[PDB]
Amino acid sequence: MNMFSSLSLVTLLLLTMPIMMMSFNTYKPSNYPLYVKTAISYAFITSMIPTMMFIHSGQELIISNWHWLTIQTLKLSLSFKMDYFSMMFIPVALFVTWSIMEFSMWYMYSDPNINKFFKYLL
Amino acid sequence: QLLYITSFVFVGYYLLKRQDYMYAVRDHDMFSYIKSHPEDFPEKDKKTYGEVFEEFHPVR
Amino acid sequence: SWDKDVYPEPPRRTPAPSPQTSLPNPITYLTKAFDLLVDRPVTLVREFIERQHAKNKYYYYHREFRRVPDITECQEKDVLCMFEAEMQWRRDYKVDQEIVNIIQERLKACQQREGESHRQNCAKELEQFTQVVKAYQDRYHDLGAHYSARKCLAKQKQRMLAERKAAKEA
Amino acid sequence: YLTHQQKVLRLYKRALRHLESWCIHRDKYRYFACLLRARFDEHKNEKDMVKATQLLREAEEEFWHGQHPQPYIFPESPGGTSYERYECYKVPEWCLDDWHPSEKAMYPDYFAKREQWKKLRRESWEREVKQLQEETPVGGPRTEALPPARKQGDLPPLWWHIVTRPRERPM
Amino acid sequence: WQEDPEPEDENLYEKNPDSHGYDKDPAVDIWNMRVVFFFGFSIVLVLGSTFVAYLPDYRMQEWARREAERLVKYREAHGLPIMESNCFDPSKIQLPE
Amino acid sequence: PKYEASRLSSLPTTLDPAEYDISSETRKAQAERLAIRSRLKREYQLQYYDPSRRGVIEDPALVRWTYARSAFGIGPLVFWYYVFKTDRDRKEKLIQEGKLDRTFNISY
Amino acid sequence: VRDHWVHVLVPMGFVFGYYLDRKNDEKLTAFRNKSLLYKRELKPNEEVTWK
Amino acid sequence: MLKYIIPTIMLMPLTWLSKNNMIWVNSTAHSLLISFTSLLLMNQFGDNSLNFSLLFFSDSLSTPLLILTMWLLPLMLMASQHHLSKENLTRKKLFITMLISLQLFLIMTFTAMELILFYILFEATLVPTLIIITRWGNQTERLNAGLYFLFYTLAGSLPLLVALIYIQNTVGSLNFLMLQYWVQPVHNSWSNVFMWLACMMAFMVKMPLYGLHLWLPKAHVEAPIAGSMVLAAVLLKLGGYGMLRITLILNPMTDFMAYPFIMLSLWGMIMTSSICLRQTDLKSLIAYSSVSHMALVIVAILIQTPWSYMGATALMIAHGLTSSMLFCLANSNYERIHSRTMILARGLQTLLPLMATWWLLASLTNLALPPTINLIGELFVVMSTFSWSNITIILMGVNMVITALYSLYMLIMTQRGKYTYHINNISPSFTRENALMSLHILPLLLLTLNPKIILGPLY
Ligand SMILES: CCCCCCCCCCCCO[C@@H]1O[C@H](CO)[C@@H](O[C@H]2O[C@H](CO)[C@@H](O)[C@H](O)[C@H]2O)[C@H](O)[C@H]1O
Ligand SMILES: CCCCCCCCCCCCO[C@@H]1O[C@H](CO)[C@@H](O[C@H]2O[C@H](CO)[C@@H](O)[C@H](O)[C@H]2O)[C@H](O)[C@H]1O
Ligand SMILES: CCCCCCCCCCCCO[C@@H]1O[C@H](CO)[C@@H](O[C@H]2O[C@H](CO)[C@@H](O)[C@H](O)[C@H]2O)[C@H](O)[C@H]1O
């Protein structure tokens, strides 16, 4: 449970970190695309763990971590569904995106706004 | 400038006295008339909302 | 941390491991790594924080509202009585909204918990949800944005008159 | 506005390009291109200009029927896949005037050379305006053609925005 | 008539390349940037966002939930309906007719 | 098969029968058009190339355009009125009769 | 200070405004500790329930 | 409310007694301090409104509008001080005084308990607003814009006064707390039909209702930047706030009386959104955009559902920041090229990269990208009008498409494409301008984290 739910959220939080670093906390413009590509490759690894737990025992869960708003009898919460479809799609999407960013590091090499290009892909 | 403020306050004070007096007189007149004419100002019998019927108008 | 009667969960049944393979389970070794590298340092930080918390124990309380006369007992246009009744009715309305929210949370937890067997195993929750929504609908539905205890009463009396008529024609 | 000779030559080029779009293969295109040329060479010496205009009009009717619906377009030609692709990177040179002095300090050699061009522009302008006044008839220009410089040290009138335009691949 | 010609537009950057755009006088310009940035961002936005994040149970929606939990517990422990259709007791209502 | 022009697909210039019969009158008109274009081009260029100019070159044609442009009224309201009124009368009738399902409808 | 004395005007306006808002509550104390909802017995050192 | 009234009044002596070169620093700094203290109005209770005195109160409807009002004053000061730089000192101080006097009337208007007091303050806002437009607008037809704005308002507001005085005679009071308990149903009669129209038409003109909206684009094209900012963000919402209050005493007659206005609103929002696709003046495009957005607010108020009122409150706040930001963006271009023609200065992202980002964010909120409070408000109204009648989803959905089309069309036309060759005075964005844009969008986006404080009393 605790490893499954923590690692499935780490996959998402890891992807946002290169976006947060654009606020200049610890930003290396020299190779931002390498930084973005590395995070995608690490997110793919972290997502393979809950996928493996699902394939093993069929473990599925819902995370409703933050109560955002309640409109009378309609409670809205930030809620994540780690189920069959998400557990299988996320590693595939990250694997394909990992190749595309690595391809992009060569295809868009001369674009003067390559950094923004990788932020937009992310 | 000082005489401007003083003149306004001096005149204003007396105007406020007559103002407050005239509303006191109006109220004194009104209550005397109600006491002299109890038949025109009956103490109405008041129902609670559990007893009174109000139509419901749904907002759908 | 919460009342188990308000937010019940059935007892949990986890099967034991039963390997039919000589290959090691990667999840078992990742689990041990997670315990050593994640949980224990996390637990150590938490225990330090709770030790600070125990040195400064102070309390807060759940506010209790005395009951006051309802709008049914208020003389017409008597705003002092109407005001207290209206405020009480508004507090009750918010409470009934959260009662429905509790029952909906029960239903949704059961649906996820029961998996492919939810349609059969969540019947009791479905029934309780059906009843509270019906009661909630009767009390508060169709009042409009300018709702009030007065309008709420007018609706109940309209419902009561329709029920009295139907019983008479029987 | 276009002469008869210009219309025939434009049609020949346009017809050949669409024929290539159809043929694709170089050996096949070479064969049919020569046949197409022989159709133009047939009526090359037509001196009856009413007949010549009939030939062109039918030729253009033939072209419209036989044109490729998706002809090949050079990537940077109008309508091509790279047309205007690099416009976002073209920045006009007046933008450097607004650079902060610390930015200009990063390129001391470049900005000293830029000042010489700006001085060349300032000192030339009056002679350019005067040359255009002297050479423009009373009614004003009848065409858009601009003249060369006529003396030594003069620059051709209205040169700045041609000479200092952005590079086609500016970044 | 006799009238002044239209003034030419002025670029604040020509005299003051460091201009923040608030004033032609550089000292005033810098002061005006500082009050806007400090009172605007450091105080209202940062402290105002913190103040809003910690409002004490805005409009009792947390109290309502606790109170709902208390009533659901009590009513189910005593075999009572979670919620009744009637908002007000019928005994206190006198219907017409 | 001849070309049929449409509002959204014009006749090609190579197929336009008036492009091949160009007389002295037509040529004179084209020269007059080129002269107007050239005169405006020069007037624009003497300002655009002026090294001392900083600003916008005001275009009277643009100003005339915006000025000219800045210078089916009950039927759809009536139409929409009857669509919504008819729908809501039907809906209200069913609720009063109980024939409309509102089992879980407690948000509005 | 003739340089910065004007910067106390809006702050003083707020203090005066705050004080006058409080004085107005002193005129609206007819139901203090008398509403059916909140009425109670005074604590031993209490003069009034709110001010 | 005296803790807000008095310090606002003191801004006047502050401005007049400041050193000549400190008038913008002092007024801006101290108006920001007033704005900070306005957050004390968030002490809202679940049942009762915050009732200060016999004159003023603050519930969850007025509080967000108050905070928006007092936030907007320093922004207007920042936005105005550049184009007023050549003005002589006394006329600058008079201009700032009008803005301060506008804040004074507005915060009193939003907090009055008694409806005649609300009426007088509601009417008093006309004077400084009219003076700001006719005295400090640039063009000849600012005089006509003033008369249209003045007389559209008074054509509706005088019947409202007669109705309000009539209601007090019949009911005995116009205190809004009293009206909540003594309200009686409005029966069918021609007299009540005109009472309804007299109670509502003044607010319809302010919103503005479609068909009574032509004063608005006229006013915006003539107003200086501060005039547009307050007009778009607050003055329109006076009518929205007025309707949300006075509908209390109009039931059940609103049931059938709302239809013609709902039809005007529902169709008008499509008409005005389409008109935006063909507008050539940038300010006029933003003005028509407001009409379309406020049509949703009118529908929400008229159908009177808890969901629609919450959406109306969020839409009113969200539109105020968004539309004010767009006028500020439009004005930043104008202060360079001195034209409002949208097609004049193109490709500005090449020349002003960071201002392009502000344009992008303002456009994204204008088309209501989730989860901006712009979408939250719109979504809640769309939710509620579907229950009112399912067919409305067709008009709501079509309006969403057109809004995205004109919002992005604005962005593509001015920021993308090629830059205009002859426009060579596009100087880099000033710190003042960047701060101004960010002081709109940042609080707007931060409200996504805690939307409940802008959802109003029905929350
Ligand atoms: C309760 C909250 C109140 C918050 C109010 C915030 C207002 C902030 C305004 C700051 C503007 C200061 O702007 C300017 O700075 C310094 C202050 O020493 C002075 O500038 C100069 O004044 C004289 C000499 O001329 C010197 O005493 C001073 O050292 C020098 O810096 C100016 O007199 C002042 O106008
Ligand atoms: C007796 C009842 C009447 C009570 C009156 C109480 C107030 C009396 C104020 C008297 C002092 C007036 O002060 C006189 O006017 C203004 C502001 O003050 C000052 O001059 C002003 O010029 C400009 C503004 O135009 C600013 O730099 C600044 O506001 C101030 O220096 C004069 O230099 C001063 O001589
Ligand atoms: C943009 C503006 C939109 C305007 C929308 C206009 C809506 C028009 C509503 C029409 C209904 C007016 O209100 C109507 O008045 C008449 C007054 O005679 C009332 O009827 C009353 O007079 C008639 C006489 O003809 C009697 O038959 C009837 O017994 C009596 O009650 C109706 O009970 C009421 O329904």
From Swiss-Prot, chain A:
Tell where it localizes.
Mitochondrion inner membrane
- Which residue windows are transmembrane per the record? 4-24, 43-63, 87-107
Positions bearing N-formylmethionine:
M1
Subunit architecture: Core subunit of respiratory chain NADH dehydrogenase (Complex I) which is composed of 45 different subunits.
Q: Which family does it belong to?
A: Belongs to the complex I subunit 5 family.
Q: What is the protein's known function?
A: Core subunit of the mitochondrial membrane respiratory chain NADH dehydrogenase (Complex I) which catalyzes electron transfer from NADH through the respiratory chain, using ubiquinone as an electron acceptor. Essential for the catalytic activity and assembly of complex I.
- What is this protein identified as? NADH-ubiquinone oxidoreductase chain 5
- Please tell me the species this chain comes from: Bos taurus
Q: Which gene encodes it?
A: MT-ND5
Curated annotation (Swiss-Prot), chain B:
- Give the function comment from the record: Accessory subunit of the mitochondrial membrane respiratory chain NADH dehydrogenase (Complex I), that is believed not to be involved in catalysis but required for the complex assembly. Complex I functions in the transfer of electrons from NADH to the respiratory chain. The immediate electron acceptor for the enzyme is believed to be ubiquinone.
* A cellular component term, taken from the record's GO annotations: mitochondrion
Q: Which gene encodes it?
A: NDUFC2
Q: What is this protein's name?
A: NADH dehydrogenase [ubiquinone] 1 subunit C2
Q: Does the keyword Mitochondrion apply?
A: yes
Keywords from the named record = Acetylation, Electron transport, Membrane, Mitochondrion, Mitochondrion inner membrane, Respiratory chain, Transmembrane, Transmembrane helix, Transport
Q: Which organism is it from?
A: Bos taurus
Say yes or no: keyword Metal-binding present: no
Q: Which residues cross the membrane?
A: 1-16
Subunit-level organization: Complex I is composed of 45 different subunits. Interacts with TMEM242.
- Locate the coiled-coil region(s) and give their ranges: none
Location comes to:
Mitochondrion inner membrane
Q: What post-translational modification does the entry describe?
A: There is a minor unacetylated form of subunit B14.5b.
**Which biological process, per GO, is one annotated for this protein?**
mitochondrial electron transport, NADH to ubiquinone
Swiss-Prot record, chain D:
**What is the phylogenetic placement of the source species in the record?**
Eukaryota, Metazoa, Chordata, Craniata, Vertebrata
What assembly does the database describe for this protein? Answer: Mammalian complex I is composed of 45 different subunits.
- What is the role of this chain? Accessory subunit of the mitochondrial membrane respiratory chain NADH dehydrogenase (Complex I), that is believed to be not involved in catalysis. Complex I functions in the transfer of electrons from NADH to the respiratory chain. The immediate electron acceptor for the enzyme is believed to be ubiquinone.
Q: Where is this region: Disordered?
A: 131-152
Q: What is its main location?
A: mitochondrion
Q: Which gene encodes it?
A: NDUFB9
PANTHER family the record matches: NADH DEHYDROGENASE [UBIQUINONE] 1 BETA SUBCOMPLEX SUBUNIT 9, NADH-UBIQUINONE OXIDOREDUCTASE B22 SUBUNIT
Name the chain's protein.
NADH dehydrogenase [ubiquinone] 1 beta subcomplex subunit 9
Q: Where in the cell is it found?
A: Mitochondrion inner membrane
Membrane-spanning parts: none
Topologically, how does it sit relative to the membrane? Peripheral membrane protein
- Asked if the record carries the keyword Ion transport, the reply is no
Curated annotation (Swiss-Prot), chain F:
Give the bilayer topology. Answer: Single-pass membrane protein
| Subcellular compartments | Mitochondrion inner membrane
What pairs make up the disulfide bonds?
A: none
**Which Gene Ontology cellular component terms are annotated?**
mitochondrial inner membrane; mitochondrion; respiratory chain complex I
Alphabetic keyword roster: Acetylation, Electron transport, Membrane, Mitochondrion, Mitochondrion inner membrane, Phosphoprotein, Respiratory chain, Transmembrane, Transmembrane helix, Transport
- Give the range the annotation lists for the signal sequence: none
**UniProt keyword Ribonucleoprotein present:** no
Top-level lineage group:
Eukaryota
List all membrane-crossing ranges: 72-84
Give the modified residues of type Phosphoserine. S23
The protein's predominant localisation is: mitochondrion
Function per UniProt: Accessory subunit of the mitochondrial membrane respiratory chain NADH dehydrogenase (Complex I), that is believed not to be involved in catalysis. Complex I functions in the transfer of electrons from NADH to the respiratory chain. The immediate electron acceptor for the enzyme is believed to be ubiquinone.
Oligomeric and partner information: Complex I is composed of 45 different subunits.
Q: Which family does it belong to?
A: Belongs to the complex I NDUFB4 subunit family.
Q: What is the protein name given in its UniProt record?
A: NADH dehydrogenase [ubiquinone] 1 beta subcomplex subunit 4
